[PDB]
Design a protein around this ligand. Structure first.
Ligand SMILES: N[C@H](CO)Cn1ccc(-c2ccc(Oc3ncc(-c4ccn[nH]4)cc3F)cc2)n1
Ligand SMILES: [Yb+3]
Ligand SMILES: [Yb+3]
Ligand SMILES: [Zn+2]
Length: 607
């Protein structure tokens, strides 16, 4: 049972295809059109079905050319309102019908962000982008909003002729709108069955540049050149991922660089990965996010979690594949460095929530819980830690990569649960069932806090980060002048970030230490969003007032929740910046992404 959906479960009926014909209205901030759902009955004598909707205005529902009866139930908070549709004829098991729903989105659609020209790079055109994961597809169109149902889709999107529409699908042509010569229709086709949370749309003054045989980088004109260089390893990463998980079945692997308000690092929308512009560091140092979104073309998009309770399967395996891709390109010691850093991020999440918090569990019960609120590093890092621990237990990376490939093949185009994964792991490793029977499955899968067993990690690249971090932490005022810019000479940007992350776990440091760090390291000049973020968190937690405008700026000039959310919390926890953080949130709230606004509001306790 998917307790996050109000629609009929896959055991009643299944959506096989969506044909979406819509028009993007920027003056009304509305998406108007028809969603034609080809639904297949799974039961005999099926006379009605229920769909998910959230803030959708419904004009009518047409089945076999005639308007049919429908009713919208009472709203269930973030879940939206159920939409019951009366079928005009009873269906036998396996019978299909097309249900054509005329709908209109609310300007407040939690799935969309409408941007005025001033909120874009070029300042001449408006912009739109969607974010459907996890349960926001219902805020775009009426659907069975559950990863347990996979469907194909075709789309026709009418937009002003000067703009470009893009979707998580193959571009299937374009023409002037016959009903409106000032608009253009962009056509799309997604031939591989996907869960609806993967349906994506972007409309803006977009340009493209080819960066590989099957990859174009899309963005506003001002960011194309920077993006083309930043993500130039995409094809090499696709070839490694193909070697690890089998053929790439999606045809195209495009990347879209979104405006700074994009709430996530990346979103694995099939054919068109969505990335935050905060990845544009100038040196490819944040390319693991691309390796991660590429990996989802197998774990997540081919093998999908049946419900959001089993989401760890999506991220845990993706982070596992991502670290193998980066391990193949830069070495095994680098995979251990990232894996160890990942354990440190799990330590932080477990500390923030508390070691008894149900959100630190690998498998959660999301009944009555908004998935956006449960979202954190736990499914990622705790999931990864389990696979890395199993890898060491079962004979090493080469043996465990054999399981991952067989796992992807076995469950391709399917939605599965933690028990499905576990039976397959036990089946594949039948000659090692004694080893598998030593795993504390109850604690690993269902217990809060840190995992019962910590894997083994090579320390070659981490040693230098811990050594410099410990030198600063143990330093007294008369040791401050022993620090020099030469302390960072043999540290890569990743090692600088791990140095700051280690130091931040012991924050605050004395204000004079933080002041000396800026004197010798000039961390204020670093543009790399990951390093900048940790440095400003260190400054704010260490109570440096000079860092307040810098932190307020980073929290508002970009909207990637990984940075915006903790920056606002740190600023709210510091008495000197508390009123400023609260006022800044209030004035930016209207211009913010609907989910980032809700979550920043909750963290700050501002309604
Ligand atoms: N996917 C790309 C990465 O490329 C980024 N992205 C965009 C949107 C989301 C998203 C994913 C899941 C989600 O809901 C859930 N969050 C956490 C848990 C959980 C906690 C412990 N165990 N399970 C279970 C959940 F259903 C909310 C938002 N992610
Ligand atoms: Yb075609
Ligand atoms: Yb079994
Ligand atoms: Zn992911």
């Amino acid at each position: 049972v998917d307790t996050c959906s109000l629609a009929s479960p896959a055991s009643v009926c299944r959506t096989k295809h969506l044909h979406l014909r819509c028009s993007v209205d920027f003056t009304r901030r509305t998406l108007t059109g028809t969603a034609a759902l080809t639904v297949q009955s799974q039961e005999d004598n099926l006379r009605s079905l229920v769909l998910d909707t959230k803030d959708l205005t419904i004009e009518k529902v047409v089945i076999n050319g005639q308007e049919v009866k429908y009713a919208l139930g009472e709203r269930q908070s973030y879940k939206g309102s159920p939409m019951e549709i009366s079928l005009p004829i009873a269906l036998s098991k396996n019978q299909e019908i097309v249900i054509e729903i005329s709908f209109e989105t609310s300007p407040k659609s939690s799935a969309l962000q409408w941007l005025t020209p001033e909120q874009t790079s070029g300042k001449e055109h408006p912009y739109l982008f969607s974010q459907c994961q996890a349960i926001h597809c219902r805020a775009i169109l009426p659907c069975q909003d559950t990863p347990s149902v996979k469907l194909t889709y075709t789309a026709e999107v009418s937009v002003p002729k000067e703009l470009v529409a893009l979707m998580s699908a193959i571009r299937d042509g374009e023409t002037p709108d016959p009903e409106d010569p000032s608009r253009k229709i962009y056509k799309f086709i997604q031939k591989v069955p996907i869960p609806c949370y993967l349906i994506a749309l972007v409309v803006g003054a977009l340009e493209s540049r080819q960066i590989g045989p099957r990859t174009l980088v899309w963005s506003e004109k001002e960011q194309v050149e920077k993006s083309a260089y930043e993500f130039s390893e995409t094809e090499s990463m696709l070839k490694i991922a193909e070697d690890l998980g089998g053929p790439y079945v999606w045809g195209q692997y495009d990347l879209l660089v979104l405006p700074p308000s994009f709430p996530y690092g990346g979103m694995e929308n099939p054919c068109l990965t969505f990335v935050t512009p905060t990845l544009l560091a100038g040196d490819k140092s944040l390319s693991n996010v691309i390796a991660h979104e590429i990996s989802h073309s197998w774990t997540g998009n081919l093998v999908t979690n049946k419900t959001w309770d089993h989401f760890w399967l999506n991220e845990g395996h993706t982070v596992y594949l991502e670290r193998h891709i980066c391990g193949r390109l830069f070495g095994e010691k680098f995979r251990h460095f990232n894996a160890l850093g990942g354990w440190g991020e799990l330590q932080n999440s477990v500390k923030t929530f508390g070691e008894t918090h149900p959100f630190t569990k690998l498998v959660v019960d999301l009944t009555d819980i908004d998935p956006d609120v449960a979202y954190s590093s736990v499914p990622y890092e705790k999931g990864f830690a389990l696979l890395f621990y199993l890898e060491q237990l079962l004979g090493g990376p080469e043996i465990f990569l054999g399981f991952l490939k067989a796992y992807v093949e076995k469950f391709s185009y399917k939605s599965i649960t933690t028990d499905d994964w576990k039976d397959f792991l036990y089946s594949y490793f039948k000659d090692k069932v004694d080893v598998l029977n030593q795993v504390d499955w109850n604690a690993w899968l269902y217990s809060p806090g840190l995992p019962p067993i910590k894997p083994n990690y090579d320390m070659t690249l981490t040693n230098a980060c811990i050594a410099l971090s410990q030198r600063w932490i143990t330093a007294k005022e008369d040791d401050l002048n022993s620090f020099n810019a030469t302390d960072l000479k043999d540290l890569s940007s990743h090692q600088l970030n791990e140095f700051l992350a280690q130091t931040l776990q012991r924050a605050p440091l004395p204000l004079g230490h933080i002041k000396r760090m800026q004197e010798v390291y000039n961390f204020n000049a670093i543009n790399n969003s990951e390093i900048r973020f940790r440095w400003l968190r260190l400054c704010i937690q260490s109570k440096w007032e000079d860092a307040i405008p810098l932190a307020l700026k980073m929290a508002t000039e970009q909207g990637r929740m990984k940075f915006t959310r903790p920056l606002f919390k740190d600023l709210a926890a510091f008495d000197k910046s508390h009123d400023q953080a609260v006022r800044t949130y209030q004035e930016h709230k209207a211009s913010m992404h609907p989910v980032t606004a809700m979550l920043v509001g909750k963290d700050l306790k501002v309604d």
